[PDB]
Write a protein that binds this ligand. Structure first.
Ligand SMILES: [Mg+2]
Ligand SMILES: [Mg+2]
Ligand SMILES: [Mg+2]
Ligand SMILES: [Mg+2]
Ligand SMILES: [Mg+2]
Ligand SMILES: [Mg+2]
Ligand SMILES: [Mg+2]
Ligand SMILES: [Mg+2]
Ligand SMILES: [Mg+2]
Ligand SMILES: [Mg+2]
Ligand SMILES: [Mg+2]
Ligand SMILES: [Mg+2]
Ligand SMILES: [Mg+2]
Ligand SMILES: [Mg+2]
Ligand SMILES: [Mg+2]
Ligand SMILES: [Mg+2]
Ligand SMILES: [Mg+2]
Ligand SMILES: [Mg+2]
Ligand SMILES: [Mg+2]
Ligand SMILES: [Mg+2]
Ligand SMILES: [Mg+2]
Ligand SMILES: [Mg+2]
Ligand SMILES: [Mg+2]
Ligand SMILES: [Mg+2]
Ligand SMILES: [Mg+2]
Ligand SMILES: [Mg+2]
Ligand SMILES: [Mg+2]
Ligand SMILES: [Mg+2]
Ligand SMILES: [Mg+2]
Ligand SMILES: [Mg+2]
Ligand SMILES: [Mg+2]
Ligand SMILES: [Mg+2]
Ligand SMILES: [Mg+2]
Ligand SMILES: [Mg+2]
Ligand SMILES: [Mg+2]
Ligand SMILES: [Mg+2]
Ligand SMILES: [Mg+2]
Ligand SMILES: [Mg+2]
Ligand SMILES: [Mg+2]
Ligand SMILES: [Mg+2]
Ligand SMILES: [Mg+2]
Ligand SMILES: [Mg+2]
Ligand SMILES: [Mg+2]
Ligand SMILES: [Mg+2]
Ligand SMILES: [Mg+2]
Ligand SMILES: [Mg+2]
Ligand SMILES: [Mg+2]
Ligand SMILES: [Mg+2]
Ligand SMILES: [Zn+2]
Lengths: 53, 134, 122, 27, 50, 86, 52
RNA sequence: CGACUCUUAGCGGUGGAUCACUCGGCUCGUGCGUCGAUGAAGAACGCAGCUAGCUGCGAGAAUUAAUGUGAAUUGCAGGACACAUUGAUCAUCGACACUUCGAACGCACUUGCGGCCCCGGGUUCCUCCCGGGGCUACGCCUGUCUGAGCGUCGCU
RNA sequence: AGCCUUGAAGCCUAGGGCGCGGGCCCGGGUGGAGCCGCCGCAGGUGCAGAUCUUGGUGGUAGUAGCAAAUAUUCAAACGAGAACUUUGAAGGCCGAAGUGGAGAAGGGUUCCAUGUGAACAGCAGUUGAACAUGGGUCAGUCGGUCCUGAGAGAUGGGCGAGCGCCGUUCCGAAGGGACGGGCGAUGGCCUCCGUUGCCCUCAGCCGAUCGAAAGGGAGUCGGGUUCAGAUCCCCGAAUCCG
RNA sequence: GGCUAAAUACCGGCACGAGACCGAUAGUCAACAAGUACCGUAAGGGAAAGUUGAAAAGAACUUUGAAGAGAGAGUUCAAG
RNA sequence: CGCGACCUCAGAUCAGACGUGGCGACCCGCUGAAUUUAAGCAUAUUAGUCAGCGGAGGAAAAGAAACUAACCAGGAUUCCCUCAGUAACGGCGAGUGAACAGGGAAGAGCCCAGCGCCGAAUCCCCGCCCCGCGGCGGGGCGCGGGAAAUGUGGCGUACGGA
């Protein structure tokens, strides 16, 4: 799917918070909040060079 | 080989339609071959199994020549319960062991008007095919 | 002693109402039994008397609607619920007569120049 | 004849916080 | 509050009734997977928002 | 005192439940729903939130009447007939 | 409402009602406190209904 | 001596990798291509003998009728004088039914106030009270009725 | 005419080996159902790092700590079990701007009875606002309900591509009412009165509607009663409105 | 001023078929009571979570303990 | 003054109808950026694209030349191939960029106003009779009502027509 990995509003915390600069899931109150997103090294992200039809 | 474009041979689809089959379809899936004597008498090969039928277990731990009455057709679990095909629990109470209908042979049929109608229809469609080949 | 719809079909409206009343009284007693220690047999009867109530009401409602349709059959204007449902867009279509209409100009053209059946030699 | 299970849900915490309790400034 | 609207008291009453453990005969059902009511709510641990 | 101390003063609800969409997004002072836009006749819907459109689109609910239409369509929306009686 | 409750009780059990008090319970049900006229004994009536 | 420490190995833990499974996805292709004031989509609250959720249904409420099917459903109980042209169950679905809000429609949105017509019970013709039923929204087309104008006139 | 329930993959192994190496073979164990060689094809194909992602686990470490608001002690009971529960007795504290007795907002069953002592209540618990099983909120008179407030908001109108917006008396034929009178029609305790239709007569309100559980706004008090409700239940005595 | 089928389009819907695709940190967020639980006043944000066994045969009974837990015993090809 | 026509305009819980909201992959009409590229940046590009608003249908839109051409001519619309990264546009930079012809898929053509002739020859609704009646229509009969000469119907429309 062309949406896989992208159906989130993740945003990078930026430097200074002692974490890598990968974009992170917003909000709180669930396991998903503050996790990595989008990048191909992330669980639940988008794969590298998604295959095309 | 299958050629019908509207019949799926997909494994996932065929298992899903087996395990979600409605009650009146599980009845047809729960069919047993007839004995050699019954098969000759009626010209039918298989019948859907029914309560009060008398069967022989031909596979598993309980196989043998003993004929027992069908006491319960548990279509939800896809098994039948047969007289004397049972074991004991830890507390000593006896519990029926489920046998799949495809692993028994019907020696005597529970006959009523509807069953005689179903046997007749099966035997007639068979003869139409035999004359078609002949 | 069970209630079947086939039994109730010919019964008059008054009998069904009386038959309905007996069931409703019986259900009320059962709901009292449900809370005052009734037997499992009485609890199981609750569902049977409920569906019996539904059967009688179903036959009363059906008997009434058939007569209403006979009453309004030849009438120009009918209650909205006796008019065909179909879908909203289908109810707004040009009806059968309106779609078949043609201008006299179109009728004359089709009379004078009908499409012919022909073949061309190979 | 089983009556053992139990459970109770609650909010999942989140640790998106920043202390920042100092400054030099020491230009 | 004691001062309540009928609509609020009706919403609260439904939340009261959902807040029970599952019947224990659900466990013996043929294809059952549910072990407990995973939607239990505690008036102090998590709030209704209304 | 903008943190912990100020959080103790909040005891006045801004929103309540909405009679149309049933979400606690009905602004009481503005008499408007933040979610569905009630009392506007048309439903509030935007294309910058695809996730929000799939949370309340047709299909997510009960389909009380639409799914009977899907069944009736397969027989041409026939009416006023019954199967031939036994 | 109370008027409807009163008329239903009279017709269902052929008794007479002095007054009716109602509340809606925390579980959403409505409870009716129906008082019978002084010439009817609730204990006797409860026996007919099957309460006691 | 013996602790402690380190290395290796057996066994035991902690942990849930791996592997095998897949009633799920994803992609492509085909046919059809159908919502609503006859009240949609959506939302709320209810409904099971034991039932919280999911699922289904709407006070006829885990469903009625009909048709096909042909002996079950099932976790437990029960069997209505449920059970074979006195039809279990499932399926189909054309009959009937379908609470509250919602374009949402008497006015408001608190389960607040009405108005008109008819019906039933109190009473005792009207009134009055209670209950039931039917109506009472905006725009707009055709026509109908009732009107308006120091608009144009005709006869008086 | 590969392997495999006479045991596949996977995993483990101070077993025997091969290869410069990437790796691979065999032995033994566990495992329980599939797998591999060779010629070709294809690729989401090889990790030590990226303050990499997600999950798990360490040392630190039985360590920091469990020190704000003066304080506990004796006996007995239940109980397997008591510094912490209950009863009794002491010694203390809050000291009527209370650590007392009642409400508003908010909560939403936390309330009450009984039971449990798994998890939770940063020691424990025989206890709890935990868990489980059942109960509990009664009104003409107490509030809402009605009024208008600051304000909000339709219609007419205006503007606007348009969803719509402005505006609240402003570019409006904005009254569906009435004492009475005259013409009829229907009924009934048919005497004569109602109701009802039309006409005459009369008519400022001038702004739909919403807006307060602290403002305006008629009228309920005494006693008793429950495990939990009472100006609501029962007893008695009243009162407003229609 | 006006009407007009066909060949064309179709990541929504109803119903189907297939694949050199992925195989539970993958593939849809969602293989499961998932747009759920949970967070936010709100607009919104949004997971984790698959596998006993062929068959429940899911361990009767004895014994220590207040119990959790144990020791025996038993089911199963296997509870290694 | 009264009565009566017409015109313009009102009120009706008047008789019978119709619109509203949703979904929105594809379609039509608007409105409409900025990240971005130009190694800066303002024109330009991004892009008539995202976002925003309206309206549909099973398809939509378009469509039977006020066309292309300049040939020995073709002949509605839509789509595919090619024309063609071409003619052209462009701080003539970065970049952008069609058409005709040709080969195919499909193939379908028509109707008014006007100018005229026909005694309005036309239409809607109500009431009764026959037929049908879950797509509300066919025929007959009303000195029944209205619309319509401020123009309905038939013939006829550029390929000419009467
Ligand atoms: Mg992924
Ligand atoms: Mg013509
Ligand atoms: Mg709190
Ligand atoms: Mg505010
Ligand atoms: Mg329930
Ligand atoms: Mg039925
Ligand atoms: Mg049947
Ligand atoms: Mg109010
Ligand atoms: Mg080793
Ligand atoms: Mg296996
Ligand atoms: Mg791959
Ligand atoms: Mg790796
Ligand atoms: Mg690594
Ligand atoms: Mg220490
Ligand atoms: Mg206090
Ligand atoms: Mg107190
Ligand atoms: Mg503790
Ligand atoms: Mg308490
Ligand atoms: Mg406004
Ligand atoms: Mg008010
Ligand atoms: Mg007030
Ligand atoms: Mg009193
Ligand atoms: Mg067109
Ligand atoms: Mg997983
Ligand atoms: Mg996943
Ligand atoms: Mg994992
Ligand atoms: Mg894996
Ligand atoms: Mg997961
Ligand atoms: Mg695993
Ligand atoms: Mg083993
Ligand atoms: Mg009307
Ligand atoms: Mg630049
Ligand atoms: Mg640059
Ligand atoms: Mg720049
Ligand atoms: Mg520019
Ligand atoms: Mg441009
Ligand atoms: Mg857009
Ligand atoms: Mg729109
Ligand atoms: Mg629309
Ligand atoms: Mg459509
Ligand atoms: Mg054109
Ligand atoms: Mg063309
Ligand atoms: Mg070229
Ligand atoms: Mg451009
Ligand atoms: Mg061309
Ligand atoms: Mg062709
Ligand atoms: Mg003309
Ligand atoms: Mg032309
Ligand atoms: Zn809303």
């Amino acid at each position: 799917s062309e949406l896989a990995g992208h159906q989130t509003s993740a945003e990078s915390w930026g430097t200074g918070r002692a974490v890598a600069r990968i974009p992170r899931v917003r909000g709180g109150g669930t396991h998903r909040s503050g996790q990595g997103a989008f990048g191909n090294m992330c669980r639940g992200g988008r794969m590298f060079a998604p295959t095309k039809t | 080989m299958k050629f019908n474009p509207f019949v799926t041979s997909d494994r996932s689809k065929n298992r899903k339609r087996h395990f979600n089959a409605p009650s009146h379809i599980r009845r047809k899936i729960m069919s047993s071959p007839l004995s050699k004597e019954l098969r000759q008498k009626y010209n039918v090969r298989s019948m859907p199994i029914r309560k009060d039928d008398e069967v022989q277990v031909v596979r598993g731990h309980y196989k043998g020549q003993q004929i027992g009455k069908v006491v319960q057709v548990y279509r939800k679990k896809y098994v039948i319960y047969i007289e004397r095909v049972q074991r004991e629990k830890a507390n000593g109470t006896t519990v029926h062991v489920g046998i799949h209908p495809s692993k028994v042979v019907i020696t005597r049929l529970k006959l009523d008007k509807d069953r005689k109608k179903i046997l007749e229809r099966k035997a007639k469609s068979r003869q139409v095919g035999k004359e078609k080949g002949k | 002693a069970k209630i079947k719809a086939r039994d109730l079909r010919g019964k008059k409206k008054e009998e069904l109402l009386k038959q309905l009343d007996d069931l409703k009284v019986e259900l009320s007693q059962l709901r009292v039994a449900k809370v005052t220690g009734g037997a499992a047999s009485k609890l199981s009867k609750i569902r049977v008397v409920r569906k019996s109530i539904a059967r009688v009401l179903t036959v009363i409602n059906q008997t009434q609607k058939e007569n209403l349709r006979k009453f309004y059959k030849g009438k120009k204007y009918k209650p909205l619920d006796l008019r065909p449902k179909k879908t909203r867009a289908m109810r707004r279509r040009l009806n059968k007569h309106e779609e078949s209409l043609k201008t006299k100009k179109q009728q004359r053209k089709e009379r004078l120049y009908p499409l012919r059946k022909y073949a061309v030699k190979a | 004849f089983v009556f053992g299970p139990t459970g109770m849900p609650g909010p999942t915490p989140s640790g998106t916080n920043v202390g920042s309790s100092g400054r030099s400034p020491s230009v | 509050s004691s001062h309540k609207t009928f609509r609020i008291k009706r919403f609260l009453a439904k939340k009261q009734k959902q807040n029970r453990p599952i019947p224990q005969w659900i466990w013996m059902k043929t294809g059952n997977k549910i072990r407990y009511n995973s939607k239990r709510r505690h008036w102090r641990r998590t709030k209704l928002g209304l | 005192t903008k943190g912990t101390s100020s959080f103790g003063k909040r005891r006045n609800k801004t929103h309540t439940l909405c009679r149309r969409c049933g979400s606690k997004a009905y602004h009481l002072q503005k008499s408007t729903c933040g979610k569905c836009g009630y009392p506007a006749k048309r439903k509030r819907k935007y294309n910058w939130s695809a996730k929000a459109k799939r949370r309340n689109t047709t299909g997510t609910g009960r389909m009380r009447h639409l799914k009977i239409v899907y069944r009736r369509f397969r027989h041409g929306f026939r009416e006023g007939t019954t199967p031939k009686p036994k | 409402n109370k008027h409807q409750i009163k008329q239903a009780v009279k017709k269902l059990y052929d008794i007479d009602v002095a007054k009716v008090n109602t509340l809606i319970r925390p579980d959403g049900e409505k409870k009716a406190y129906v008082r019978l006229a002084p010439d009817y004994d609730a204990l006797d009536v409860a026996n007919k209904i099957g309460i006691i």
